[PDB]
Symmetry: C3
Subunit: 413 residues, 3 copies
């Protein structure tokens, strides 16, 4: 065949009760810095776009060829001309050679790839704008090596960079070796990471950028992909247990954190489900919790847990009422790192969003959708103290209740 255009786009407005700007984002809480994402409905004011241009090809012998480029940009500005603050950048550029006649045995229907890409098998928890696992970078590998006709595996090498790619003395390559095995509903992912002399990166001045930074890492994922809402109702669900040590201590963006100590230790649990309550109501609960010790400073600790609950109610074939509630508890002990002060407390979010679409309302993933919304946000005052250049506690976002309103669209195809 030929060309295909795919992509994602969110774009909207959010204002407080006075018709002016406020803070918003799935990562605005102090916990957000270590991955503590909260509900995103009516809580995203940026114009984010991803453009996927593809060149597919099928040969008569069954062999496939595929090329894809991803160009992305994310703007907080509402203006029609954002050249000065543009973030337009090529995120992906890779080729896939699939179903080769020459590959036999366990390599029968396997697909070889190379270039810069997001791993095909990454997966996320949509309502919280957080990936469960996100393996990206530049490299190569093979998908779907079928063993015994009931155990498939992926093997790959992904390369990333740490520090300033322009400053040779403050730049390091981080490599990741990963084997991903799938056996029915079960998934076992194991990665080995390594960035030689990461601890010896000198900044522009001549001093050590870190000194106690890790040079290696280990990462693992244990996942369960169900075809029912946790086995008790129609729907679907996914549960994943993540573990990381050293450079592997950042369990979502694998190999994306160059500041982790050798002893940085992380455990994380991601879980969510989709289930129809009635021919008009659908519910999707999700939880993300993490425990990270000795991450950036000796003796530090970052603990938080997010609970998100999205509910849609079909009224028409085109109109639905969506609701979202987020709850997050956090206890962060930064030990002076980044001028952060130890903090603990909770964050809450309530959103009511009338939604229009043409697709199946009971489907959380049917996308052309336009929504109007209102949110209420509150939190323990102590969280204001985590940072001084933070969102919580800045000018006009420190009181108890904060109200926001807006309109936005979101799609993918």
């Amino acid at each position: 065949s030929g060309f295909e255009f795919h992509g994602y786009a969110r774009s909207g407005v959010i204002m407080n009760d006075s018709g002016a700007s406020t803070k918003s984002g799935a990562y605005i809480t102090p916990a957000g810095e270590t991955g503590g994402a909260i509900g995103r409905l009516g809580n995203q004011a940026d114009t984010y776009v991803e453009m996927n241009l593809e060149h597919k090809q099928t040969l008569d012998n069954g062999a496939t060829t595929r090329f894809k480029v991803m160009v992305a940009d994310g703007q907080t500005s509402y203006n029609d001309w954002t050249a000065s603050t543009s973030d337009l950048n090529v995120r992906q550029a890779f080729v896939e050679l699939g179903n080769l006649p020459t590959f036999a045995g366990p390599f029968k229907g396997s697909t070889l790839w190379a270039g810069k890409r997001f791993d095909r098998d990454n997966f996320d928890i949509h309502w919280i704008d957080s990936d469960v696992v996100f393996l990206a970078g530049t490299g190569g590998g093979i998908y779907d090596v079928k063993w015994n006709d009931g155990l498939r595996s992926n093997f790959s090498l992904y390369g990333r960079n740490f520090g300033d790619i322009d400053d040779s003395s403050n730049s390091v390559q981080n490599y990741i070796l990963t084997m991903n095995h799938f056996a029915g509903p079960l998934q076992m992912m194991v990665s080995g990471l390594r960035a030689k002399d990461n601890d010896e990166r000198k900044d522009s001045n001549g001093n050590l950028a870190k000194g106690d930074a890790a040079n290696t890492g280990v990462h693992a994922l244990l996942g369960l992909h169900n075809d029912s809402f946790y086995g008790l109702r129609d729907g679907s669900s996914k549960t994943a247990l993540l573990y990381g040590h050293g450079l592997g201590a950042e369990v979502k963006g694998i190999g994306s954190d160059g500041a982790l100590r050798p002893g940085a230790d992380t455990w994380r649990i991601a879980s969510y489900g989709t289930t129809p309550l009635s021919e008009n109501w659908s519910v999707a609960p999700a939880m993300l919790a993490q425990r990270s010790k000795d991450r950036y400073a000796d003796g530090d600790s970052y603990q938080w847990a997010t609970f998100n609950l999205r509910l849609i109610q079909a009224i028409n074939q085109n109109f639905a009422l969506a609701y979202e509630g987020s709850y997050q508890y956090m206890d962060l002990k930064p030990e002076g790192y980044n001028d952060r002060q130890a903090v603990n407390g909770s964050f809450y979010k309530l959103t009511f969003a009338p939604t229009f679409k043409v697709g199946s309302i009971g489907d959380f993933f049917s996308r052309p959708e336009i929504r109007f919304y209102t949110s209420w946000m509150d939190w323990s005052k102590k969280l204001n103290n985590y940072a001084s250049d933070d969102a919580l506690g800045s000018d006009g976002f420190n009181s108890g209740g904060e109200w926001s309103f807006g309109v936005q669209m979101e799609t993918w195809f």
Copy 2:
């Protein structure tokens, strides 16, 4: 259906009688700073490109779905690699849900939209590179609410930003509420603008960026869309009378000027027509005049009137001779704002441009076209004094007559 690729692109060269650079642009005159556009033929040396990638969709029930992104860049450099000066940026990203089976009554054939976009109903005077009205930003709204079967209306909320989107104390959101009514050839547009605490934006130093800047504004447009050359000959024409106060004092780019005073008052007239003189000649006159008082400085005044005249002459089915004459009078009293000195005088432009195309020559909008040209420009010497970093009066562009030559292409599809 699926994917659609649409766009615009102009690109070419302009040199003076010595084979070296000169000044060019529809906005080069002192009047240009307040909107005083002049003829653009042979007067645009940049490579400007707009790329529109769309994903349209039609459901069996008549409902439509549409997503569009616009990526643009504008370069003055003639080089094949402009990475260092690139202005590539996402101008638009929106979705439209049209003709929903669930929308009845006045909402019958209406289309709902959200995201970042240029209003569907903006319209321009092409030969002068000036929109009559340009509503753009991020928001949402609805098009074509049919009342009594002879009165359609559009309602919407558009959001924009003033100042540095990165500097929190020098950054403000400006919101625009607008109702646009159409009744046959008549159009009545009304907008309310509001940017809370615009007057309190402190620059990076700590001082007020303005102090006497407006926080609100009002804007109106009275348009007449004819199906004849001003009712006296075959063709078409449009006339619009624009008025603005406060933040609405910038009558073209609505909500785009954050330095306007509360008492800034502006009146503007836009008018043009298209008419075939014979089966081989076509003429298009256009006029843009403006009166703006107390705009940026107390007691200031900007007045100017542009007269453009584009003539084409079919010689073949592929060759045409195009001519353009521009005349502009201006009287500007800046009262010391920006180091500008009060000035008054006139500007002239004559352009002869052999043109090649495949489309209908009598049509001013059939686009694939390549043109060669020569231009002569002259103006009142006094205009050289408006500014010191101006175009008129810079090194090599201060004498009486100024000749230019070049080639350029222009399209849209």
Copy 3:
């Protein structure tokens, strides 16, 4: 017709025997600064992408219409988000009017164009990532003016810029006039270049950027396009003899070098061939040699010669073994320019690269291909002294043997 998406994309990884970064690139040798490219197989660690979006159109009368934009970006970073270092930029934007019913005689099937583009008739030596001739910029022209039914010619005007396009006193336009004639396998190209007052460009401080820089230039290309491997075996081959003086002294990127002296004199020879040794082996030898005197400093001299040899061996219908050997000699006498020290010596490169593809292996240009590789590089220690911020001699790339490994994809469609 409508839309066409075409492009090029290379993307991969290169690491040394310690799993860390190394130097790589077809232009890393001291000779590279004056065009001395070496083998590129397994010697390109960047993610370079070119996206070509086109809008073609054919009218019933045979007349064609074509619009093309090329958007490119090149990153050395392996990361999935390169907004901070993005080089995304519009490289081309042009229109072509082909086969006009009105064009008769020698203009019969000729094609008119204008805008920013790379000349349709540029051609390169692929394995060494070097164009033989590269005419690009902004202008207009005509392709295929048929004389006597055995002599075709292209005539064109190309515009380029020297210096900082933003700094008016350090900015100059360089214009190129070129006539390119083809008579069977023979090609004769002649260009006149001129940048008025190039020698008078004052940098930001107020001093002359150069002072002894050239204002004009001359360029000539003599080429032979064969339908056999140098007339002794099946295949193909091309040989070109290039000459340049003054501004024409940079014989590849015509009009792209603003620092050349008036007496800069350059001779270059490019030649390569393609030939199948057997139904499984294919060989492609290539040579690039250059002699450049009085280039940037009076009495300077840059001489070098690159010999590249690519060999592929089909093992399957999808698996091939590719080998590449590069040899380069250089004798450079910079005469103090840029802090370079006169140097002489040779560079060697051996690369073994198992390659996967679906297309014709014996075809060096069939593209979807994924390769794994290992390279060995060594050079005369003296070359380390050419510059201090060079690649040869930097930290960890100064010893004798340097090994590298990696995987990468490369395509075009």
